[PDB]
């Protein structure tokens, strides 16, 4: 599939759904990988997913969304360095080459 094609996957940028191809980037101020998004909402990569993406706490990779959970920070000191009460998503993902 190297010739011109009409139904190639494209990268999701908001309202992420299971199966979406996504661009996963390091977010410096949160010391965590995040989905590239145009949303104001943070979409953090689940820690369980980094080994499937060849990542260690590198710039960017492509993955596929497997799960998303809507979360709240319950402590001022938390794993995502967000303020108390911040709402965000945590996303499990696998490598782009899974169907």
């Amino acid at each position: 599939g190297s010739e011109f094609s009409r139904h190639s996957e494209k990268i999701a940028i908001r309202d992420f759904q299971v199966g979406d191809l996504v661009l996963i980037i390091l977010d410096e101020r949160h010391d965590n990988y995040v989905l590239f998004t145009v949303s104001p909402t943070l979409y953090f990569l689940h820690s369980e997913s980094l080994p499937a993406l060849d990542l260690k706490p590198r710039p960017w990779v492509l993955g596929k969304v497997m799960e998303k959970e809507y979360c709240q920070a319950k402590k001022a000191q938390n794993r995502f360095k967000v303020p108390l009460g911040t709402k965000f998503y945590r996303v499990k993902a696998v490598s782009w080459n899974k169907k």
């Binding site: 959970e69 809507y70 979360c71 709240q72 402590k75 945590r90």
Partner: peptide
Amino acid sequence: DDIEVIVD
């Protein structure tokens, strides 16, 4: 318990 899942 630093974070909580609202909806999965």
